[PDB]
Design a protein around this nucleic acid. Sequence first.
DNA 1: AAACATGTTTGCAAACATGTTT
DNA 2: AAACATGTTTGCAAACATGTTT
Lengths: 182, 193, 182, 193
Amino acid sequence: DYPGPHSFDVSFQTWTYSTELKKLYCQIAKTCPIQIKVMTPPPQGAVIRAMPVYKKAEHVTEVVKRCPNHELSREFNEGQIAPPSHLIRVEGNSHAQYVEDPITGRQSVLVPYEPPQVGTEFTTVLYNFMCNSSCVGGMNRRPILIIVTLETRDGQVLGRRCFEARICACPGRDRKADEDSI
Amino acid sequence: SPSNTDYPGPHSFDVSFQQSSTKSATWTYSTELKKLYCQIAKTCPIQIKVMTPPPQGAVIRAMPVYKKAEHVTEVVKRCPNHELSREFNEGQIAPPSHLIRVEGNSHAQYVEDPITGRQSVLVPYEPPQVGTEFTTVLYNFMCNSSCVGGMNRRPILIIVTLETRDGQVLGRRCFEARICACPGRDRKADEDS
Amino acid sequence: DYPGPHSFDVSFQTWTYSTELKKLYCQIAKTCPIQIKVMTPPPQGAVIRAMPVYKKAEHVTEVVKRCPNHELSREFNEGQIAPPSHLIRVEGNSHAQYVEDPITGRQSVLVPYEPPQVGTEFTTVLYNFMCNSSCVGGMNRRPILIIVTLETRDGQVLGRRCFEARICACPGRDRKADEDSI
Amino acid sequence: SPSNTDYPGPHSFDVSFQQSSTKSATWTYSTELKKLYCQIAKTCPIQIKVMTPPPQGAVIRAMPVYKKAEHVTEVVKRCPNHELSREFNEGQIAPPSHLIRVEGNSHAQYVEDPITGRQSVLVPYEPPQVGTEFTTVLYNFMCNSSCVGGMNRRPILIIVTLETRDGQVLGRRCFEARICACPGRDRKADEDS
DNA sequence: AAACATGTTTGCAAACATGTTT
DNA sequence: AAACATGTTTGCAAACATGTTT
Ligand SMILES: [Zn+2]
Ligand SMILES: [Zn+2]
Ligand SMILES: [Zn+2]
Ligand SMILES: [Zn+2]
């Protein structure tokens, strides 16, 4: 976590969030509203990039893509702006652009930053996760965590926040049970 | 859509399953249920028995097909996930799409029917070893019977058929196949049902 | 209603039944257990025929078949013993035979009678209704009622009972609301 | 999969909808939304306007197609129910499978593309009546946009195209079509959305 | 037009099916 | 083998979508 010059921050108000576990439990392809908050207007082009990555040191070097099944299953792909391989998708924004790093091969999705609505106090982004946290041939139940980063139009980082994502089928249950381990 | 009725044929063709050890829980068979319960990619020994020497190029084709009427017309291939997954395909020579595989036989040849598009695997028939009453063939089933994007837990059944070197069916036997994780458990539960 | 020599009778213990409305509310293609009770063993071949027919005098002469959509929609038809046109189906009985009257063209389904199980007090039959009570091109929401008849092996009637059938989507709701009209 | 982008073409081709009375609630149009809301089997008057006389056998083809990317590849036909229902077909000469119909024109010819299997209907182009600025064509939409076994409430949109007598596209305009029961209500609600 | 009839969609939890870890 | 992890199926009611009756 790096608040940066604009005191960047992410927060949450079919899914659920354990504040103190910094974990987001949510169903697949369902919509996840995510709250963005700055303290001072970021630069101009300023973008919000959401990138997935494995939590465990063992697997951090491996890119995070959708399992083969979902990747090529008309379902969810057919009529789509985004690439079928990308795990993270953003809904409700034509400007949203999906990117594959030529060198690292890492997939991510950017959305141009925009101040909140008048009176509001949050820039709300709509994220969709397109593979369960357990798809064989994909995450194979390997915990992953999202890295939402506020960057300068040319890719300079201005801030970064991160939470563990676990997209499943019973976020309620899983969260609760995951709360029992303590 | 391929036939599934038992047909002993002129050579009193027959398939059966006899347990390779004396646990060994990698698989199990309900003679009573005509069901074979077995673990994915693990090896299944299947016993072939004739009563009179079959023709010349005689072959044994094993083909998978959905049990229920609603799906019979759909081919049976390996789910997308496994058809790519590095594992089970890396040192393999067999078509990653094919469900049924035979291990321990270089002559084993995999085939996709140009018209029906149905995948199957053949092995040239060879009589038993001296003093032995069974020709044993080693099959491998490459997808759980619940792989999403594949069988999606739709019952399938194997159709092992003894055919003439030019495809004329001399004999056929069928058994339901349910490849899972706990063949022991599943069979048991299936029997308490 | 004609009890007949064997004091024939039908009763009920995804569906529901208004005793005093002689109406059966049940979802489509879902299973309906129906209780048969006699007072004295019926003849030998004795069968139980279930036939649908329109309640309203206006439409009684028109046969009752499944609407065109369902009639030829792989769904529910594909792997099936019974004809895709037949509204009423019985599940759990290989002996069940579906029949189309050559002259009247009327569809119906028979099931060989069998005494109850030991200790039991009912011969229970499993009926499936395969079209909503409202399928356009079919019942077009025209009330129909089932005529379960106990007959002699050669078609002589030994008894007959009948209840109004209304296969819908919310048997609960519909029943309740249908109970409000009074 | 047929194009849906507006293309005025050399003859400044254009389609518009002007209300036949002075209620008449049988249909309505959201110029703003590019959506036509109309009742099944009832008649929809559609205004055609060019700026320069089109070629010779020039025709006006109206073809239906699903709006959403996921279904575009699927043809648009009348649900099974209506394709048989005695009504709307009894005294009719038009293919009971076809969704779009044109009333008041003997020359109107219905067509199924042999390769794509796409159904459409053509009417030879004829200039406006003297003193009139529009060529009016009468369309009929034969299935609610919610017929199960048909559109099953999948948004569709009409592609009226002005073509040369031998199928070369000279102009094309599109509008979303939503045939229902309460065009009034639905349009209103659609606008409050 | 306003009310009513009815199939659908969405959300949710229980009982279950089935691969994985212990 | 026994326990645990997790996707599925089933049932159910609310809010809704949409044809029909009034
Ligand atoms: Zn996946
Ligand atoms: Zn698989
Ligand atoms: Zn129907
Ligand atoms: Zn229709």
